[PDB]
Design a binder for this molecule. Structure first.
Ligand SMILES: [Cl-]
Ligand SMILES: [Cl-]
Length: 28
């Protein structure tokens, strides 16, 4: 199974993606 390191890295990647969406929402 995915260990804590891989799972935490995926939550980091999720954060990058969600933050890019937050930025996109302000874009025009
Ligand atoms: Cl791992
Ligand atoms: Cl991304």
């Amino acid at each position: 199974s995915q260990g804590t390191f891989t799972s935490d890295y995926s939550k980091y990647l999720d954060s990058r993606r969600a933050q890019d969406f937050v930025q996109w929402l302000m874009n025009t």
